[PDB]
Design a protein around this ligand. Structure first.
Ligand code: CL
Ligand code: CL
Ligand code: CL
Ligand code: ZN
Ligand code: ZN
Ligand code: ZN
Length: 90
């Protein structure tokens, strides 16, 4: 199980918002990387300081070389939080 958690991006329960702050990554590179660790990826939003990305509260994400920490504040958003497009929809 896991303690109850809410997205800082959307307010939806069932998500913990992380911030990805390095190294340089495109959004699709970040999402492919996380999916590659078997992580279910929720909504994402590009920001000035990096990317906000929702992961499941059970997750304890570890991606080598990536700084991925629980977000403290949502700021500097450049776009609405949205789910990544599946290839059929892209
Ligand atoms: Cl927990
Ligand atoms: Cl791409
Ligand atoms: Cl933060
Ligand atoms: Zn929290
Ligand atoms: Zn949802
Ligand atoms: Zn975008």
């Amino acid at each position: 199980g896991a303690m109850a958690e809410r997205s800082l991006l959307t307010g939806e329960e069932g998500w913990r918002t992380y911030k990805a702050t390095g190294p340089a990554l495109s959004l699709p590179a970040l999402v492919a990387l996380l999916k590659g660790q078997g992580l279910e990826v929720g909504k994402v939003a590009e920001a000035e300081g990096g990317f906000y990305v929702d992961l499941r509260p059970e997750a304890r994400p570890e991606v080598a070389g990536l700084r991925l920490e629980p977000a403290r504040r949502v700021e500097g958003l450049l776009e609405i939080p949205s789910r990544t497009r599946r290839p059929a929809r892209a």
